[PDB]
Amino acid sequence: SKVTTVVATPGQGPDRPQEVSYTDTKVIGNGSFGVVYQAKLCDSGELVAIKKVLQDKRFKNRELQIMRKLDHCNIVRLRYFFYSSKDEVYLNLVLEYVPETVYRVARHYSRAKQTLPVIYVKLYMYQLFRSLAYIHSFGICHRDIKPQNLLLDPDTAVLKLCDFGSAKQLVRGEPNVSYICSRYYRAPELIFGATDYTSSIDVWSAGCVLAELLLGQPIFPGDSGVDQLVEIIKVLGTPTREQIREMNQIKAHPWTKVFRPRTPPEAIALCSRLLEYTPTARLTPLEACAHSFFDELRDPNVKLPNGRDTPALFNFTTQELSSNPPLATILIPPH
């Protein structure tokens, strides 16, 4: 068809562009950022997402700077990036394409008034925390964890975190904006306006994702930035003055009463260790990866419903173990 040909720096490593060609460019999605397209590489047929952003020639692009540093089985690959052109200049990110997301698959089950089975919950949640461990190890917060940004191949069961459009490297020094994350998955410290929040916001959002996978709908659907807070109180109860200080009247409805009757205790526990008001009292991605809930994935006779083996869950790097390498003994069992 129309066959566009550009000179694209690869995302990985030495800064040396090569010629690259692609053809079936259909528009998908919009936003303050720019536009995302879908397309087909000629060299192989493989489908690609191309996010097209306006770039100030002087200033560096945060997403690209973050994406180039990343190489991890559970995160989208930036395959290439290339510039294009009034006297206006655009960055184009050429990203790996996966046709489904967790939101979409979850939405299938929800419409059948039906459960996503616990095995897929474990698999998906585990791989998520795993991608968080990795990006947190570079001080990078994602700041937009939600099912719509979890790529998923349902045959392999491989989940890959994506959209690093709100991602940012947090630094002890600097303030950062508090209106971020998508509203249902926003951490309570951010509703209270905090500008010194840590990577522990992602963990809350991972918690809101779990909760949702267990319930069939979002756990805290709020009307406004502000109602979001009331929807949390509804469940967590009112936070103590002490808790409120740590972030910077109603009784707490017990977790076990929150979910469906037949729900795993190990899962409900984990949920309560993620959805803590005090951000320091939330598990870290690696502590959660190691949480008892995920024990079924360390059984050597774990198989996927469709027969196949699980994807690789223990090829942990130095880097991913950075934050607490004792845990390697729990996370990596015998085999």
Ligand SMILES: CC[C@@]1(c2ccccc2)C2=C(CC(C)(C)CC2=O)Nc2n[nH]cc21
């Ligand atoms: C082309 C962009 C896309 C996306 C981008 C951001 C979030 C989620 C998905 C895209 C899909 C399939 C989709 C979820 C049906 C629609 C969609 O937006 N998969 C992707 N893989 N890489 C980028 C993508």
